[PDB]
Design a protein around this ligand. Sequence first.
Ligand SMILES: [Mg+2]
Ligand SMILES: [Mg+2]
Ligand SMILES: [Mg+2]
Ligand SMILES: [Mg+2]
Ligand SMILES: [Mg+2]
Ligand SMILES: [Mg+2]
Ligand SMILES: [Mg+2]
Ligand SMILES: [Mg+2]
Ligand SMILES: [Mg+2]
Ligand SMILES: [Mg+2]
Ligand SMILES: [Mg+2]
Ligand SMILES: [Mg+2]
Ligand SMILES: [Mg+2]
Ligand SMILES: [Mg+2]
Ligand SMILES: [Mg+2]
Ligand SMILES: [Mg+2]
Ligand SMILES: [Mg+2]
Ligand SMILES: [Mg+2]
Ligand SMILES: [Mg+2]
Ligand SMILES: [Mg+2]
Ligand SMILES: [Mg+2]
Ligand SMILES: [Mg+2]
Ligand SMILES: [Mg+2]
Ligand SMILES: [Mg+2]
Ligand SMILES: [Mg+2]
Ligand SMILES: [Mg+2]
Ligand SMILES: [Mg+2]
Ligand SMILES: [Zn+2]
Lengths: 129, 145, 150, 82, 155
Amino acid sequence: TRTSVLADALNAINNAEKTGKRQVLIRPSSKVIIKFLQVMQKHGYIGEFEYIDDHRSGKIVVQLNGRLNKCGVISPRFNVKIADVEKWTANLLPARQFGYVILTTSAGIMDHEEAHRKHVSGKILGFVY
Amino acid sequence: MGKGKPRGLNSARKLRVHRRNNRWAETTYKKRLLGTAFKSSPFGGSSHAKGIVLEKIGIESKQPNSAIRKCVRVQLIKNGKKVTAFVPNDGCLNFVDENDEVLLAGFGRKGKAKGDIPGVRFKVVKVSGVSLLALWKEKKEKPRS
Amino acid sequence: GRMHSKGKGMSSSAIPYSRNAPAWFKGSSDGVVEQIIKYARKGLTPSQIGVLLRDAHGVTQAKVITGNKILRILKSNGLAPEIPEDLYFLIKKAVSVRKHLERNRKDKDAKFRLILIESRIHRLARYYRTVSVLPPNWKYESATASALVN
Amino acid sequence: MVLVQDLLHPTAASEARKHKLKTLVQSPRSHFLDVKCPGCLNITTVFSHAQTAVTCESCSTVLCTPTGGKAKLSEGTSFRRK
Amino acid sequence: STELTVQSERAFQKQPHIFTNPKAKANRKTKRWYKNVGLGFKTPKTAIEGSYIDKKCPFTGLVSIRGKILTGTVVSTRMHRTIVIRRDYLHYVPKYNRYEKRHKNVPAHVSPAFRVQVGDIVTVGQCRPISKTVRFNVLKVASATGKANKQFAKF
RNA sequence: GGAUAGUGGCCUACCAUGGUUUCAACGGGUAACGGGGAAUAAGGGUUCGAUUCCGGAGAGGGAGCCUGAGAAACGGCUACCA
RNA sequence: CGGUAAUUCCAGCUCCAGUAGCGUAUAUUAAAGUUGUUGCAGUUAAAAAGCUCGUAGUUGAACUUUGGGUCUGGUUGUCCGGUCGGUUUUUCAACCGGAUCUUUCCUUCUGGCUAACCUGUACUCCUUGUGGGUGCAGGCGAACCAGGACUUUUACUUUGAAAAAAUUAGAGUGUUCAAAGCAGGCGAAAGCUCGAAUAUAUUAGCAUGGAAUAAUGGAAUAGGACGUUUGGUUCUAUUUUGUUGGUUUCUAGGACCAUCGUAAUGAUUAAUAGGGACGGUCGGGGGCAUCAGUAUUCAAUUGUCAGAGGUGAAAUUCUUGGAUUUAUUGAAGACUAACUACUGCGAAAGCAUUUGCCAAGGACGUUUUCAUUAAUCAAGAACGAAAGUUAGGGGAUCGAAGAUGAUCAGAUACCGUCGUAGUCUUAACCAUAAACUAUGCCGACUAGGGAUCGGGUGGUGUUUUUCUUAUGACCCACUCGGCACCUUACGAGAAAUCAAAGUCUUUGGGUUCUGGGGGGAGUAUGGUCGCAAGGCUGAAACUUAAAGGAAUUG
Ligand SMILES: [Mg+2]
Ligand SMILES: [Mg+2]
Ligand SMILES: [Mg+2]
Ligand SMILES: [Mg+2]
Ligand SMILES: [Mg+2]
Ligand SMILES: [Mg+2]
Ligand SMILES: [Mg+2]
Ligand SMILES: [Mg+2]
Ligand SMILES: [Mg+2]
Ligand SMILES: [Mg+2]
Ligand SMILES: [Mg+2]
Ligand SMILES: [Mg+2]
Ligand SMILES: [Mg+2]
Ligand SMILES: [Mg+2]
Ligand SMILES: [Mg+2]
Ligand SMILES: [Mg+2]
Ligand SMILES: [Mg+2]
Ligand SMILES: [Mg+2]
Ligand SMILES: [Mg+2]
Ligand SMILES: [Mg+2]
Ligand SMILES: [Mg+2]
Ligand SMILES: [Mg+2]
Ligand SMILES: [Mg+2]
Ligand SMILES: [Mg+2]
Ligand SMILES: [Mg+2]
Ligand SMILES: [Mg+2]
Ligand SMILES: [Mg+2]
Ligand SMILES: [Zn+2]
């Protein structure tokens, strides 16, 4: 089966961005996807993206910016206990300096810097660097 | 690829049962879990063993090198098992003599043969309460006969 | 990629953009609903019905014109059968292989398939039991399945 | 189809070419052909992929032999589009 | 489940220290004593309107609910006046950082006030040691029906 | 009901047939007393914890008990084995 | 390392390392991403079960409240130090809240306290005023309680309460330094005086916020939801009728069938998920039934008089009272060529002469239908080449066994000749193969080339030609499904190579399985399965420094 759509989508992104396609298509297209992408937009790893409504399921067209390096997804959505964020981001992203860890939470879908300001953690989805 | 192993947030058991039952091909873990040290390994899973020199043997070594190695068959005290101990340094089985209490050591290799001495897994240390190196170098002297 | 075989098809109906009606294809909701419940009393199944509605008459989907699907129409008039449509069509086939095996003791690749169809049924039954269509503590098989058919 | 395609607006050639499923929107490419039989002066909305030996409204004329894809329209018959 | 007979042992069971006065001539005769249980638990009228005595009921007995107010579904009901509640849960295992779905069946006494069936979810209060294993007492069958009144397809 | 300081299959009568189990029951092993902790030491961990504290046991075994608020005590006793 | 200059043995002088210590042995942790959750491998190095089904497990498409304004609290950078190196605002900021209003309730009431003025009852202490408050009938309740009513339930995460001390980290401090310790510090040195912290420990429970994530649940026989319903039915029952025992009320609270209304009355998709229906097809798929070729054999009758077989170079070996050869048949039980391919189907194993029947099946198409049924799977199963095995039938040729003829130092080995068992089949078993694509299954996405085939579209295309044809058969372009190549690899890879063995130290889509130096060993044992052969399952002791893999040059 097609399991984690988010992953299965971000995989296409990661393939697209690897070759230098200026865009990608993403079949299934969720809230999470869009709130994940929305996050990439707010930092700037991603251009426009255009959610098609198949009178049906979803479908997205992303515009890549040549800025994504990796559009990570961590797989069993591990629960994170606020301090353990530091151990995830340390182990996933290059450097204390720059990068983001896209985590769903009580607050919605933040990145790990926004989630530290708020003082609210939860599950992880993926990351970007 | 999914990479073999399961990845669920609720897997755990199929990890933790898998890693119990793969470990078993890790030879470190198997000896620890099955008490080969205790049930076998002449010394009772122990640093050393006092054991009576039953005879001074000369053991003709494996190939490349060629030398008769000057060893001692022992009878380990506690277990009553018989082993074969090497005697380090020039002669020094001369210093060992016959029917002595001889304290033994592992050779180094966690069982197994040290180098070319085929079927000898032990070094003599103390002969009747001294130390071969103390005899060999003659900093200490033997307690008479 | 198929349930049982290793053949990975997408033989499929597409479904057009419009949840709304294709206006010009006329009739009525009630007229089509009355059209359907004739066919529900003639014995034809939702899947057969909707073909007949589509092929000859101007229906695209009952979903579209009526609002309700078809089984949901038939249920509303008490004309949906005890054993569901899809399951019934498998329970038929099961019998049509259990019958062929009784005659042909030596025939392996049919025994193979019969083990599939049987399993396919127990997939579907176990689904239906959990829905609460078929009552539970009720197994849909072989000996009594011939009686469940006819 | 390399690097930059602007994938929201394909050329209609591609949409017509690609699978009726494998486009931006799954739109089927079947029609409800309004066939007229030689007998009665009345028009049956024949779906082009019927799956059935399609009779008329009442008279047994037999309109379309259901083949695999689109149905062969039985004998010298006439039809409107959709 | 059993049930019904009220007084049918070698002994004949009354609510102890509670009396049904013969000189007095009320309509009920039997002074049905009952307990308000607390912790926001309502006394079901099947207890107070009913007949059975039961030492081990919270409502019609000396059994005092306290401590852990557990819950969970009901797996086994076969025995006399007790139930087996299947209290599923996760178990975290840091060296993996995932979860075991674990089990523990909890045996729990029933006051026949409630009607308990298999595949019913049920809150249940710790109380005295009733029995060997049963340290718990059914307090609230949450799935009272659970599609019991409604099967039932044909319009 | 009996007992117990008291709850209880703790014991007894009569009755019912339950109870646990591949979410490892039961069995076996443990060169296993449990925990605090220890060593190792990026993160995740592994192995150790007889041992200064906290629990639990035991006083050669296995029993049985007196006194006593508190003992199934053993720098109490009775016995049998060794 | 050591065969007379041994830089490795053994001694002197040098010298190195550590140094009141350092060695040795066994554990053990690290190193070991050589146990791997993070984080390994499995085409060939060890490693994908022969295949499919399959319960538990684990995992599982998308969809329901988004956005905009309006004020209002902070919190550091700013703008000067407005100041006696520190402090208080503004010109400004981002950031985090809070209240709300937006088709919007945050759980709702029976009452207590209604703080407040939405007020306006006398209207004015009073700069010409809506600056300002003595003030109480209607009444905004969030300013709190104190009791109902009943909560969809979890996971998840928050801060909190708790997680004995020592330990652990860690603040304070002149034990002389420290390791530590809980000490200490300052006077007239007549008395006074700071300390003895903080943090962690995340497993479970308890507390409260949050509502993404994930599950779970609700109205589709509505027995549904509400209430000016209007009847009722069962109540329950306290408060006054002087106080007890009633009976029935008024009534206020249950609960339960009616009927009158109110509302937008109530089902999300219809996953390039899946199943199932239909359609035309397709196939060397399977079972059961027949037909062939034609073949080899024996035998018959037939014919023709010296050899024919065999040879690996060479021989042996057979008949002649025509064996062989020539021709007609017969029986038997075989196979089922040529086509036959980088073709088809089948879960694999495997499957090609014929028709027939029996059911099944993939793809396809489909404005069909159900609506989460799905993927993978320890237990369990189903099949499963050949051989083998019992038990039947047949036995042509080859043909494990055997005989036997040569050769070679010899050779029960090739070759040679024959030739039981089988081969073939039927009824049982067995259950393994280099059952090998030595590549688990599903899932997605990355690169072109041209082809290749099984489906499907379009071409005033060409030809068929029975005049237009219409099928057929191509060409050409593109498409769903199948089976494989070429080049660069910028991607992989130890490389061979691989468009998957890619999207992996820039490490996480889901799942099952297997491997942890070599051997010992697929052995010993014990199960368990088998008629047995044997299978499945599966050890260590002991042993050893390499065993491999791939490639390079020889
Ligand atoms: Mg030699
Ligand atoms: Mg597919
Ligand atoms: Mg499957
Ligand atoms: Mg009692
Ligand atoms: Mg012990
Ligand atoms: Mg321990
Ligand atoms: Mg201890
Ligand atoms: Mg001990
Ligand atoms: Mg102690
Ligand atoms: Mg002693
Ligand atoms: Mg004693
Ligand atoms: Mg004592
Ligand atoms: Mg003593
Ligand atoms: Mg280690
Ligand atoms: Mg490895
Ligand atoms: Mg291999
Ligand atoms: Mg989802
Ligand atoms: Mg410290
Ligand atoms: Mg012959
Ligand atoms: Mg072919
Ligand atoms: Mg042929
Ligand atoms: Mg299995
Ligand atoms: Mg065979
Ligand atoms: Mg032979
Ligand atoms: Mg095998
Ligand atoms: Mg293999
Ligand atoms: Mg090995
Ligand atoms: Zn007609």
